């Protein structure tokens, strides 16, 4: 659905806003970014708009090699450049009658 897409886009972005505030939210987005090898919604640059995330700081889960603190002062070559919304979203659309039906 485009409801599946629009909602996932909206929710992923709202969860990015809550990432600094809620360590459970942080753990959830971390597992998404690490397991699907993606960062941010459209792009890693999306983190630039999130408080507690300076410029040149992304979650460690965006790193290609996840080590403690790797997202601090990150280099573009060391991070997943693709956004999570299109990548995870296409996976959700491909598995929709197993994740959302009542």
């Amino acid at each position, epitope marked *: 659905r485009d409801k599946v897409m629009s909602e996932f886009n909206n*929710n992923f972005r709202q969860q990015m806003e809550n990432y600094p505030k809620n*360590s459970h939210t942080a753990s*959830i987005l971390d597992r998404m970014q690490a397991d699907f090898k993606c960062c941010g919604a459209a792009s890693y640059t999306d983190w630039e708009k999130i408080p507690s995330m300076s410029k040149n700081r992304v979650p460690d889960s965006c790193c290609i090699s996840v080590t403690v603190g790797c997202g601090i002062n990150f280099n573009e070559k060391a991070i997943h450049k693709e956004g999570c919304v299109e990548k995870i979203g296409g996976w959700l659309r491909k598995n929709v009658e197993n994740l959302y039906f009542q």
Partner: nanobody
Amino acid sequence: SSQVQLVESGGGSVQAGGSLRLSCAASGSISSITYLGWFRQAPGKEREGVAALMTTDGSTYYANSVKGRFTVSLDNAKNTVYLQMNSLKPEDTALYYCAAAENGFKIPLWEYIYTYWGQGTQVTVSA
């Protein structure tokens, strides 16, 4: 995480066509919970969502392979969520996990939205 604990019970071994009722007792800071879900991991297979209940409105969600046979329900007074399982098949054999999700994503049968997990209870269904 340790703010919420989930404890499953009611597993066992039954002959095909029989029934079980799993229960999951939630404790800790559970007022945050938006979905209570049941996941299962069968021998040799990845974990899959089976049934989920949204606390917000009581809505329920089922995997297609269990629709009509399994029912998820919540006894608020006991802080316990149930999975009634009827007409059990050998392919229902699995470790069943209780899980809980807080607010964030509205994808009830996807384990990536759930933060709290029980240890699992074994369900064995004989041919």
